[PDB]
């Protein structure tokens, strides 16, 4: 019960002998290759540590070390960004004129006429307009030169080497024992206070000493190459005192509890900076300060080696009621003896967080000169939404993996886990019904508007001009948060975001953030999102509940997670596994997220993004979302077809790379329909004829060529299908928004 560091000295030896023996990890693939399938198998089974061995000590050590490498490659990527933004970038030129200069940090070699990709991003630079929001991130970090980027890049590379070293050291040298990994109370206590709490406080230090004075001077008009370097603010109190008089007192107000005096670098203004169009840096500093105290205190809840504290096992068991049988008693062990259970829960919240971050960041642009960079905003919102949607699908997959691999019917008697597996046909049935309802009562009022418009009856349509369906509930929450600062949140000088309502923030004659108005089309598109979200959940949840068994095939648990079909009998049993419920829940995720990114792309270009002219603002599309989005044709004529002009006509210009990728993406998406619509039977025999030709000329390969497995073809098709569609939108969005 003692929380202590437990390690095993020099377990795995460091040698390349295993490197030369492909498949040493699997008993089955160690015997070498005899068919061309082994090649695809040694990759589809290299990270499945649970399959390699039954010891949970080794599986954990492998997982812990793996994560290290991941961090390493993340550092390498980050360091490369700073380096490319240090040597091959226009960051310094952009700093002087952020509005009229487009960010660029990728220069192509002058060959095969590919030098056309080096467009005039302005600022004596010819490169590729980036949409990663790094320039505005560095600006809000204070970075005012390419020597602070070069140093950072070097530091990231050094960290990378530490990460890989740590992975090898904590695997081949000091490998932690299982008892170490299963101290969840300790992990949470150190990840909440030490990682999140200190991580925010440490940032609240930079933001208060480097980012705030540098950004204030930059917004004051001071030349970037004339601002005092960051360290001078720390050492020279006079400089910081001039910018923030509260540094004349010192740390005395804090200890004297007179925090108020510091109300010049720690404020609750709210809204957006009128100069740069991004959340005040002062408010961000106060947020990270508060967030820190919260996390740091939260780190003192779970019990460790002393006495004070809580026992998550006891808490879960204590929470049981008159309807949920034994209650949460039995989940603690599941979540301290399974990596698939933990991963599933982690991915779900982590993925959902990514979407939530995208909504908040775009609504309240956190970086200077970010909202007026429309390409960056769009590229970020679309990105995080996908990155998150994928994780959620993974959460469903690993959940099913645990159910078919780590579930023990003995530990879960009357748990809320057995009591849910015991009513799966009520959960699934009701969810199926709501999906059908939401379907007809969301996509139907779109076909109805199409038919009524085509029949020349446009007064019999569902629009703000005819049968209206305004989102009243969403319209009231918008007003409770716009008039909140005057009542609910007095200390706040302004509302959290302009989206709720108010004036239009303009920076450089462009709309940084404009109050968004929700109408019939917003109501219609929002319910469309709900229908998709519900369906996606139905497919993944269905796979998890019946991952072990069902009226059709009452032994799936003994068949596995990645098994194609029980057989051609029972009227056909294809895609009965939980991998095939994840396979299909990916297409719906693409369908669900695609509409969301299209909804953001069109709504914004139509109702927010534009140029503030004398008396009025000119939106990218002249405010046509309301009347043009209630029909499916409007989504094709006024969105797809109309906005596709930039990408289809990008050839010959710096944006020509997107036109090429736009088509290339169509090819990949369509190519995927040869594996999603076909079957090995046809390819296997076809290969037999090819082998014959090879065996005639005596050029037949020693390894037996075999067609892709049933599950493999399903994976290859879905992979190319998602890659193609997302790539098409990536080219469309980027070339549209960068051109306009």
């Amino acid at each position: 019960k003692k929380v202590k560091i437990a390690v095993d000295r020099n377990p795995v030896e460091t040698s390349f002998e295993k490197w030369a023996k492909p498949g040493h990890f699997s008993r089955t693939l160690s015997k070498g290759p005899n068919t061309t399938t082994w090649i695809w198998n040694l990759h589809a089974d290299a990270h499945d540590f649970d399959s390699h061995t039954s010891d949970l000590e080794e599986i954990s050590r492998k997982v812990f070390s793996a994560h290290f490498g991941q961090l390493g490659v993340i550092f390498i990527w980050l360091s490369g960004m700073y380096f490319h933004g240090a040597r091959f970038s226009n960051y310094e030129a952009w700093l002087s004129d952020p509005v009229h200069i487009k960010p660029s940090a990728q220069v192509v070699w002058p060959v095969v006429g590919q030098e056309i990709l080096n467009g005039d991003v302005g600022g004596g630079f010819q490169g590729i307009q980036i949409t990663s929001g790094f320039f505005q991130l560095w600006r809000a970090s204070g970075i005012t030169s390419e020597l602070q980027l070069y140093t950072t890049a070097i530091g990231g590379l050094v960290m990378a080497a530490a990460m890989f070293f740590a992975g090898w050291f904590h695997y081949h040298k000091a490998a932690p024992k299982l008892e170490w990994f299963q101290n969840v109370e300790s992990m949470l206590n150190h990840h909440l206070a030490g990682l999140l709490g200190l991580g925010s406080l440490s940032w609240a230090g930079h933001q208060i000493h480097v980012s705030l004075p540098v950004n204030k001077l930059l917004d004051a008009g001071v030349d970037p190459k004339e601002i005092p370097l960051p360290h001078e603010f720390l050492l020279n109190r006079q400089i910081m005192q001039d910018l923030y008089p509260s540094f004349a007192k010192g740390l005395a107000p804090f200890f004297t509890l007179q925090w108020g005096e510091y109300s010049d670098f720690l404020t609750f203004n709210g809204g957006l900076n009128p100069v740069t169009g991004g959340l005040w840096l002062s408010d961000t500093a106060h947020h990270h300060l508060a967030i820190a105290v919260l996390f740091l205190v939260a780190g003192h809840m779970y019990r460790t080696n002393w006495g004070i504290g809580h026992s998550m096992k006891e808490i879960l068991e204590a929470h049981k009621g008159p309807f949920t049988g034994e209650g949460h008693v039995g989940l603690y062990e599941i979540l301290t003896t399974s990596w698939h259970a933990q991963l599933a829960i982690n991915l779900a919240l982590f993925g959902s967080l990514s979407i939530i971050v995208a909504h908040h960041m775009y609504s309240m642009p956190p970086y200077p000169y970010l909202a007026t960079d429309y390409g960056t905003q769009l590229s970020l919102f679309t990105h995080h939404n996908w990155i998150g949607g994928f994780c959620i699908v993974g959460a469903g997959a690993h959940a099913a993996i645990f159910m078919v691999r780590d579930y023990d019917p003995t530990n879960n008697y009357n748990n809320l886990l057995d009591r849910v597996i015991r009513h799966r046909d009520a959960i699934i049935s009701h969810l199926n019904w709501v999906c059908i309802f939401l379907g007809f009562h969301s996509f139907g009022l779109y076909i109805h508007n199409d038919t009524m418009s085509a029949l020349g009856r446009p007064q019999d349509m569902f629009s703000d001009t005819a049968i209206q369906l305004q989102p009243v509930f969403a319209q009231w929450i918008q007003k409770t948060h716009f008039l909140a600062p005057q009542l609910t949140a007095p200390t706040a000088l302004a509302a959290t975001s302009a989206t709720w309502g108010g004036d239009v923030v303009a920076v450089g004659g462009k709309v940084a953030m404009m109050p968004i108005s929700l109408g019939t089309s917003d109501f219609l598109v929002h319910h469309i999102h709900a229908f998709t979200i519900h369906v996606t959940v139905l497919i993944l949840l269905k796979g998890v509940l019946f991952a072990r068994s069902s009226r059709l095939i009452p032994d799936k648990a003994n068949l596995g997670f990645r098994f194609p079909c029980d057989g051609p009998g029972r009227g056909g049993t294809c895609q009965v596994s939980a991998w095939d419920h994840v396979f299909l829940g990916l297409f719906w995720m693409y369908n669900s997220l695609s509409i969301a990114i299209f909804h953001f792309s069109w709504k914004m270009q139509s109702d927010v993004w534009g140029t503030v002219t004398a008396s009025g603002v000119s939106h990218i599309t002249g405010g046509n979302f309301a009347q043009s989005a209630n029909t499916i044709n409007g989504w094709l004529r006024d969105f797809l077809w109309a906005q596709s002009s930039q990408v289809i006509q990008s050839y010959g210009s710096a944006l020509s790379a997107y036109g090429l990728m736009f088509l290339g993406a169509h090819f990949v998406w369509a190519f995927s329909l040869m594996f999603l619509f076909s079957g090995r039977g046809y390819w296997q025999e076809l290969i037999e004829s090819i082998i014959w030709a090879h065996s005639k000329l005596k050029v037949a390969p020693s390894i037996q060529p075999r067609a892709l497995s049933i599950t493999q073809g399903r994976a290859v098709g879905v992979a190319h299908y998602l890659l193609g569609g997302i790539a098409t939108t990536w080219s469309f969005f980027l070339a549209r928004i960068i051109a306009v």
Partner: protein
């Protein structure tokens, strides 16, 4: 061995109930009844969904599919090394001893089993479909 007779008053395992068991078919069409004899009270996994505590000595569980009963049969024969036997209760009460229907579980050879559906030719010695055209008889069966 004598085809065991069903005792429909056999203690049934402990289980709260599931929305995943018998439907109208059980009465309108037919259902099946697996029975076994435990050594201790143990939790097993139901081939329909969930967990149940088997009782000591005689146990009796009813399903609407033979595969479900046989699934539990293998589970008991492997996880608990039991020797379960199941029948088929028709709507009229006609119980038919389905497994093993011989005493010796199918896998094991036992004299007294006739050969049914046994073609004595290589699978590649079957006639052409044209030889059985308009005969309404399969090439394999012919």
């Amino acid at each position: 061995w004598t085809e065991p007779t069903l005792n429909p008053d056999t203690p049934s395992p402990i289980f709260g109930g599931s929305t995943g068991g018998l439907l109208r078919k059980a009465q309108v069409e037919e259902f099946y009844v697996i029975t076994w004899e435990s050594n201790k009270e143990q939790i097993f996994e139901m081939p329909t969904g969930g967990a149940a505590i088997m009782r000591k000595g005689p146990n009796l569980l009813k399903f609407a599919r033979k595969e479900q009963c046989l699934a539990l049969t293998t589970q008991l024969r492997t996880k608990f090394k039991f020797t379960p036997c199941f029948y088929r209760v028709y709507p009229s009460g006609e119980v038919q001893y389905l497994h093993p229907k011989d005493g010796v579980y199918p896998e094991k050879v036992n004299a007294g089993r006739p050969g049914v559906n046994q073609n004595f030719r290589r699978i590649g010695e079957n006639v052409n479909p044209i030889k059985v055209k308009f005969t309404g008889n399969g090439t394999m069966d012919i």
